[PDB]
Structure 1
Amino acid sequence: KAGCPDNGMSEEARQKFLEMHNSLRSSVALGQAKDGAGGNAPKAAKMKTMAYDCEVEKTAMNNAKQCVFKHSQPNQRKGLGENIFMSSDSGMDKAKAAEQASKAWFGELAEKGVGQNLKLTGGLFSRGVGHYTQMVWQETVKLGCYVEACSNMCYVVCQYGPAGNMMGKDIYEKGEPCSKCENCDKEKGLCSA
């Protein structure tokens, strides 16, 4: 989603990543996301809209180009969170990978469940829903990803700014959509950018 170097990442992929993150964040904000732990995820009071960020994409690229399925050292993406994903199909279209990745990360909520208490405890950390929680992390507003065609996998990395998943903190403030943001995108339930 725009103005980024021609570094091998497709603008269609950027577009899918941003669109999937926001639309998925919206659906959670609106109380329309199925929750594995029963019922749905609580509405969000001020779920922010994400923008694409090329600088963030760049550090995501640094992880992806290494073609090793591993979270980068927090050191190699200061201030930034990270989600990773692989498909066995190395040459699969990048935007298609973007889509599969986002679905698979978000899918943690319906598959593993989270609950009504959005505080990131040691407990909730254990359920292993950390890719979902980073996707809908309230204060995370910058998205940057890279999809690399490795020898033995199609390797997808997204990094997130500011980093989400701070232990002891809430994923998002609960409440009616738009209810705590200056300007709301009323149809989507996210604070406007």
Structure 2
Amino acid sequence: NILPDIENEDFIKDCVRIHNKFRSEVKPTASDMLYMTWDPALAQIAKAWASNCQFSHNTRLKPPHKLHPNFTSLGENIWTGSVPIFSVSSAITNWYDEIQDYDFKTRICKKVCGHYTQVVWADSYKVGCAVQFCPKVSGFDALSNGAHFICNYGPGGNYPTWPYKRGATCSACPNNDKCLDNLCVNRQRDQV
């Protein structure tokens, strides 16, 4: 298990593909789920924060900070665990599986659900991730020599509302956006 660098093409494909797989398969269906693409600037941001090896959120995701020239606010998911166990698939799946504690009807979360909601946040269409090797991670004293994985999201989600608008798939995309695997695509947005 070697931890990939932020420009590793397989790492990039995994992060994007697996985010989109969960976003495509949501239940209830989403009417407005945007297709998610890689953003190298978001990946650099994740890399810088991840190198701090702290189990807490980047402090500069919101005004008056602005880490990314094109987003007012950024979103963030963090996964921290052992090196052997780490993979893009397991980390993101771990975030998504918080759905078990989420009741879509009422938005009631029984535990921790904010990673799941950011994974499937309709309006978020750019992602960038990084993993760091961390001898110790602050806030997580139990852990030794772990993998510390952070994705940043543009624009940020986790407003006090449903992560997407439930409805017939792709029935409420922006403009005249086409649909690909239950996601709203758009040549302009999706350019990397």
Select which of 159, 182, 189 maps to 1:189: 182
Aligned-pair distance for 1:143?
0.3
Is structure 2 residue 101 aligned with structure 1 residue 112? yes
What CA distance in whole angstroms lies between the structure 1 residues aligned with 2:5 and 2:22?
26
Q: How many residues align?
A: 163
Map 1:39-188 to 2 at 5 A.
41-73=27-59, 74-75=61-62, 77=67, 79-89=73-83, 92=84, 97-109=87-99, 111-117=100-106, 124=108, 127-151=111-135, 152-167=145-160, 169-181=161-173, 182-186=176-180, 188=181
What CA distance in whole angstroms lies between the structure 2 residues aligned with 1:70 and 1:154?
14
Q: Out of 67-76 and 151-160, give the one that drifted further.
A: 67-76
| Aligned residue identity for 2:54 | V
Q: What's the TM-score, normalizing by structure 1? A: 0.76
Task: Spell out, residue by residue over 1:59-109, the C-alpha distance to the aligned partner (whole angstroms, 9 max, x if none).
Answer: 1111111122221113565610000001222xx49xx52111101000110
Aligned-pair distance for 1:11?
2.1
Structure 1, unmatched stretches of 5+, are 1-6, 29-40, 119-123
Aligned-pair distance for 1:126?
6.2
| Aligned residue identity for 1:116 | K
Aligned to 1:121: none
Aligned-pair distance for 1:8?
2.9
What CA distance in whole angstroms lies between the structure 1 residues aligned with 2:35 and 2:82?
31
Aligned to 2:189: none
What CA distance in whole angstroms lies between the structure 1 residues aligned with 2:11 and 2:36?
15
| Secondary structure of the corresponding residue to residue 107 of structure 1 | helix
Q: What's the TM-score, normalizing by structure 2? A: 0.77
- Computed over aligned residues only, the root mean square deviation of the Cα atoms, in angstroms, reads 2.1
What CA distance in whole angstroms lies between the structure 2 residues aligned with 1:42 and 1:68?
34
Check whether the contact 1:26–1:189 (CA below 8 A) recurs between aligned residues: yes
| Aligned residue identity for 1:97 | S
Aligned-pair distance for 1:129?
0.4
What CA distance in whole angstroms lies between the structure 1 residues aligned with 2:39 and 2:134?
24
Check whether the contact 1:98–1:147 (CA below 8 A) recurs between aligned residues: no
Structure 2, unmatched stretches of 5+, are 136-144, 187-192
What CA distance in whole angstroms lies between the structure 2 residues aligned with 1:84 and 1:131?
8
Aligned to 1:8: 5
What CA distance in whole angstroms lies between the structure 2 residues aligned with 1:177 and 1:184?
11
What CA distance in whole angstroms lies between the structure 2 residues aligned with 1:114 and 1:159?
25
Aligned-pair distance for 1:117?
4.2
Map 1:2-41 to 2 at 5 A.
8-9=5-6, 10-28=8-26, 41=27
